[PDB]
Amino acid sequence: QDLPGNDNSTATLCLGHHAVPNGTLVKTITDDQIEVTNATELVQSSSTGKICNNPHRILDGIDCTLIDALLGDPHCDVFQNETWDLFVERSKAFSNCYPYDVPDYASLRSLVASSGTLEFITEGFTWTGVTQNGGSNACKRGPGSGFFSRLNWLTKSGSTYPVLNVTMPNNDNFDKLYIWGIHHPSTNQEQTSLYVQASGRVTVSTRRSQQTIIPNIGSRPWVRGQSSRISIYWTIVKPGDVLVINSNGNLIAPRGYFKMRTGKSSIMRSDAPIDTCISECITPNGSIPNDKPFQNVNKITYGACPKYVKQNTLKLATGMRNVPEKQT
Amino acid sequence: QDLPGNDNSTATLCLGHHAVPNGTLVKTITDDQIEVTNATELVQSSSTGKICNNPHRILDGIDCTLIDALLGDPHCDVFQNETWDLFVERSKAFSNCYPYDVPDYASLRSLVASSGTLEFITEGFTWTGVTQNGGSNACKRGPGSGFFSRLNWLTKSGSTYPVLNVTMPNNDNFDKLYIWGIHHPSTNQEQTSLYVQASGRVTVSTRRSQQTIIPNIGSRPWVRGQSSRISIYWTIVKPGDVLVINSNGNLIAPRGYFKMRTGKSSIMRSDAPIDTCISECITPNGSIPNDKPFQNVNKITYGACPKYVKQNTLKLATGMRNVPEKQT
Amino acid sequence: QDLPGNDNSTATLCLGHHAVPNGTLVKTITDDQIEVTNATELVQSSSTGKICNNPHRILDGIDCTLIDALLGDPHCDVFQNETWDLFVERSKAFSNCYPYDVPDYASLRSLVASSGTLEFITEGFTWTGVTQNGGSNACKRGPGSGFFSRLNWLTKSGSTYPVLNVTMPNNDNFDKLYIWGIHHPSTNQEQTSLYVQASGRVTVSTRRSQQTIIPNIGSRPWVRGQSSRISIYWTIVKPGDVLVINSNGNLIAPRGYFKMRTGKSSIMRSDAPIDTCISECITPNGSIPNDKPFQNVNKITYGACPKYVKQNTLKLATGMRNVPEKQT
Amino acid sequence: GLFGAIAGFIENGWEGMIDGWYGFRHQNSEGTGQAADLKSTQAAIDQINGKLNRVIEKTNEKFHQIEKEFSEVEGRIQDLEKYVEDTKIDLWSYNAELLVALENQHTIDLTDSEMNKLFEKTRRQLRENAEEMGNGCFKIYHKCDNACIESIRNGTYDHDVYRDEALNNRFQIKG
Amino acid sequence: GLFGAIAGFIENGWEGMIDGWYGFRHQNSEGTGQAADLKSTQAAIDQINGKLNRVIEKTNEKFHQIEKEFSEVEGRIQDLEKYVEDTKIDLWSYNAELLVALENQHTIDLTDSEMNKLFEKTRRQLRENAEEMGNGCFKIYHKCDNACIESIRNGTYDHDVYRDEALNNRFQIKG
Amino acid sequence: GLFGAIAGFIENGWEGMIDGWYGFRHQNSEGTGQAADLKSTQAAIDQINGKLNRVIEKTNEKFHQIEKEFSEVEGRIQDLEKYVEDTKIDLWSYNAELLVALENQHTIDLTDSEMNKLFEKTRRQLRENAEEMGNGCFKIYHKCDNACIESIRNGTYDHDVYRDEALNNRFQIKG
Numbered sequence A, B, C: 001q002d003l004p005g006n007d008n009s010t011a012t013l014c015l016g017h018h019a020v021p022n023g024t025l026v027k028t029i030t031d032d033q034i035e036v037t038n039a040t041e042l043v044q045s046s047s048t049g050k051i052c053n054n055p056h057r058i059l060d061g062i063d064c065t066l067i068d069a070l071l072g073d074p075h076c077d078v079f080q081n082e083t084w085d086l087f088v089e090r091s092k093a094f095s096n097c098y099p100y101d102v103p104d105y106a107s108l109r110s111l112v113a114s115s116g117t118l119e120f121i122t123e124g125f126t127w128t129g130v131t132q133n134g135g136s137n138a139c140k141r142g143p144g145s146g147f148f149s150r151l152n153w154l155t156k157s158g159s160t161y162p163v164l165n166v167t168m169p170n171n172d173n174f175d176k177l178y179i180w181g182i183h184h185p186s187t188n189q190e191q192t193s194l195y196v197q198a199s200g201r202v203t204v205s206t207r208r209s210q211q212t213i214i215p216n217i218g219s220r221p222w223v224r225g226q227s228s229r230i231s232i233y234w235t236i237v238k239p240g241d242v243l244v245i246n247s248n249g250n251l252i253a254p255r256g257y258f259k260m261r262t263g264k265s266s267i268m269r270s271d272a273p274i275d276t277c278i279s280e281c282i283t284p285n286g287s288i289p290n291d292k293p294f295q296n297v298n299k300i301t302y303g304a305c306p307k308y309v310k311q312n313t314l315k316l317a318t319g320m321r322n323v324p325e326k327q328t
Numbered sequence D, E, F: 001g002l003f004g005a006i007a008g009f010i011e012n013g014w015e016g017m018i019d020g021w022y023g024f025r026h027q028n029s030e031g032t033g034q035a036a037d038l039k040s041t042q043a044a045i046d047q048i049n050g051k052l053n054r055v056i057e058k059t060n061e062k063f064h065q066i067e068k069e070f071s072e073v074e075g076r077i078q079d080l081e082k083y084v085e086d087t088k089i090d091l092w093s094y095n096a097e098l099l100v101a102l103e104n105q106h107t108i109d110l111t112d113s114e115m116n117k118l119f120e121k122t123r124r125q126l127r128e129n130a131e132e133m134g135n136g137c138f139k140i141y142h143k144c145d146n147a148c149i150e151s152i153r154n155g156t157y158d159h160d161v162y163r164d165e166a167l168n169n170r171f172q173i174k175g
Ligand SMILES: *[C@@H]1O[C@H](CO)[C@@H](O[C@@H]2O[C@H](CO)[C@@H](O[C@@H]3O[C@H](CO)[C@@H](O)[C@H](O)[C@@H]3O)[C@H](O)[C@H]2NC(C)=O)[C@H](O)[C@H]1NC(C)=O
Pocket: A187, A219, A220, A221, A222, A227, C165, C166, C167, C242, C244
């Protein structure tokens, strides 16, 4: 096309890649620090310090544990029929009613914490031949002596305590949780003074199961002016089953049932403040964002959260190797 | 080799690779769907719907749970001395003898389910001073009243129930499982009527351990015309140890021992039909093939089975990328 | 530079890589044996057979289990106030004092094994109205009859066992472990002969918890000339709490408390010899080196140890593929 | 892929190539034609089967385990039984998900590798007698009849036999 | 990296190249200059984002689980609760540690791959008219004005257009 | 391997090469010679040791855990203790098995990579003065004495110094 020129000229083309003056060191299969152009952090390691109140229903227990709320300690009566996604228990919560212990407290705190509801329904139990509604000075309902708002302390009427034998069928289509208990007198005198008989007995049964407890007399440490204890127990009654409470002494009767739900509910011990904000992931240290795949804030979590890991930093290279000239 | 030609000719060679008109999308490290020439499914996600009866010894419990079979409910007497690799319990199984509860039922169902055998050996216990062989109308053995074929309800003779105190040494070279129990009368009158004493006691011991139970009187719900319950207990007696049964009331004595085996045996709750076919992997949904590495049918399995996973499809590319001719 | 030459000559350069006559086969993503130039074993699969006594404080239990050491069996009195990182229990250890059982033995062996100390502090309990310091011929302290060096068998004084009711506050800043027990008489006569009352009762409580046990009369197998048993129980008393022991019979009282530590301590059952050498990783089979990442010696380990794995060999290629020219 | 042959310099595949995975398409004065390369097809296939067998390697069998279904509410122990199985499942699900991802990624680069390896092998063989047209095609600069093409494909092509012809025909500069 | 382009035959990077990841500095008839290659920059970026999204893929949510903090000493059951959680954490920590290591390793080789792929693509295009200086620079043996450079970079360079010029200028042996 | 140098175009290894991993054998005016390349031998070795150290990285120590041996039959709790440990072991066994497989696969491709990298580096250096014989050997088309071979190996070979000699000797077409 063109003609043979008497001049000859070349060009130079060089390929290359960028570099930044400031790379990030990242780990690989063969090296423990190799500097790349850029990386992302994959470990969430800091909390807001605040439990966001959205989207899950947080319920702050304030100075009530969930079991006190359940039982109906006077100072916890605020929680009656409450409902939660996450119940938060505070470290400063205290009990302040009759001294009780719950054999397998930890399972009770779990069954109601997962149920998510404290909805109580009163049932008409007729206690024939005993003095209902007893209370104590250790559990003041205002000026007066009182008791747990959901239990019924039964004492002898006149001069006798009959053998109580009552039934309450589960005619509804749902499971019913009944909370009940037994009083352990501090002295053998207290036993007879209260329940007439020298040894009470409580047998709570269903067609599926039975449990009989005998009280145990003896001095325990003074707690709120009392050296006696009551112990709490629970009976789930299935639809179509029947509950038969039977006792000739020391029964702390149930006033009805708690409904049981199945759902995403749980309890968390935390002193972090609830605050108004949206956050899917709750940690005792406050909410954390779940945009990263792993977190190092706390192994206790509730909700859509990153996987807890021991590493506190794990950087994913999002760039080539940094091989700079030097510059500034 | 030859001399300069006058004609100039070239050829063209092109390398390439196949493509199919129908690729499969597969996932990678950098893409979530990339189309490859071919792939294999790695997640087994369907069952035959039938428990193949080969190679493992399936035993269909039909309307007997394993504990009823063990205890010897009349309607479960078919299972006496049976043996299984997998005992299958059906949802429709029912009990139909004297009302009983088993404290830690779940461990008892496990120890015998893994033992794999119901082989029972009768031992000559001599119960001196009591009426052996009691039964009840709640447990009809045909026309008549009866009881569990492996327990022995002991009642007073005339006006006396002595303190039973018997021994049975383990002279054999194997462990012996003894199943025994205690009757809880519904009334204080039933207690004396049956066992004379106001409170029975059962203490079952070996040189290694002891357990003493006291019955608990009280009305429980009517079940098969009974408001009393018996509770089942178990004692493994090691070779060279001795069993000492000791009671002055409410003992439901053992008629001998069950042999214990150690092996691949287990129990499964399933309503799938047993059928005749070979299959190494049993799932409550029926057998599944274990040619794939992972399965999504059911997390309960018995035998050589794929690892349960949440994914229901996971395709392994077994071919190159599909870059078809008739493009997009 | 120089002028065009009339001679012309070429050279040959060939690149290549070494090969060894003896490669090692190694596994990959696509092959199950491919021969590489060299590899390293990553599975530690052999023990010295000896538990090195360094750097962890091994304590050889010799013929004492930790619970016998705790309780104070005469033959285990060597261990009083001892301290360990790893307590090693030997298969031939035996007990040789009064027959006892520990309900939840396994948690007791765990709480003290992790505490790491047997430091006992005697407290001044005053048992008013009972005969202290009882012992038995089943527990000879030398020529004479004796008992566990840390328990105190209380028997009625004169012709009366009063109701014991004592307190011991935790005024110190640490948790206190109290070990106590209850005696189950073999006969109803033994009960009255020893404790006067027909049924004893022991209630041990703190402000946090309570436990009441009633003894259970009955013949158990002859063990060291005894058919009675004592059962061991434990109560941790928190700082600022109080212990209240209360009984009208069958109490085997505590002589004070064990201090509880929190630390790296544990117990191991092993018959391997302790020997003098340094080794971070203890296995029941003897120490093993933890230079490799995985081990196949034993899944029980204590200390800085390789991760137990089922594979007994896993070779990491540390060289290129072996493609020999002559080969073999 | 890492080598950039498949879906790279080789524009697209041949749906027509039904007899092998990799192959050769040509044009000489005798005509045109196509032939599969069976040696790299086997190489890619054996690696893919090697992968497969190792995944399909031994099932672990399990017999008596723990309960995984419960019909009543029990609290602490059942809570643990459910947590043990739930976290077991999540860990094995992660594992199966990461395994087919690494696996698939590697299958796409090893088949890309074989494509490029075939290409390079042909390149090396043709020596100074052909030029790379870039698109995965070589321009052979000398008379190459069907037996000549067959010798390139079967790996016997002697470049010296046509070097002077090709080399002249190649560097005869004129336009 | 596996290909040896980045931190390999290409000695070092250009801190000056602020408009793309891979690119072309040239020196010619009009003078010296530089331009980013946007097609391989996008190819490297899309693969890195593909990786990223898959890691940042669905969080699993969990609700009622087991207790992980205890205030009293209980023995056997609590011992197990602690062992289950402790070994869960160690397994997930291993997994996160192996994941970013394989991931990072692959990012370094895929960006190395793209560098080498760009290079090879330019090599192929220039055909007989340029020689590889080794250092990632081609010596173009013919007059190549700024639109000529533009056509190489935008993938339209016709090698025939300058073949005779280049080929002469290339093989004129004399020193 | 992915590059096809080792056990690929380089037919087999040299059991005789006892001083390095990769190397050069040559033939010239002064006779024949062999020499290890120490720079790629170090490159392959450092990567292999890098891998090794990271695997041999920190042991986790554990102290009081759960019982893993039982002498009596207990049922529900012991069943769980055995299930927790059993599934822990299976998960760590899978992990060790996948780890050495990915690791080994990568070692075979990174040593293959270094072989090919050395080769390519020599290729680039010799410029227009040598031809690839295919088998991993270059035919150097000019008088190359032992110091000439030394400069190729030590990376100082100036191709211009012998370009006209080589280029003539290369394209003098005649058979
Ligand atoms: C069994 O022994 C314990 C310990 O000696 C006895 O418990 C103590 O009982 C007294 C009252 O009888 C309690 O007194 C009260 O203490 C509070 C403290 O602030 C004070 O405000 C009251 O005015 C009164 O003094 C004492 O706290 C309690 N001690 C303990 C450790 O709980 C118990 O009474 C004995 N039981 C029998 C039946 O003898």
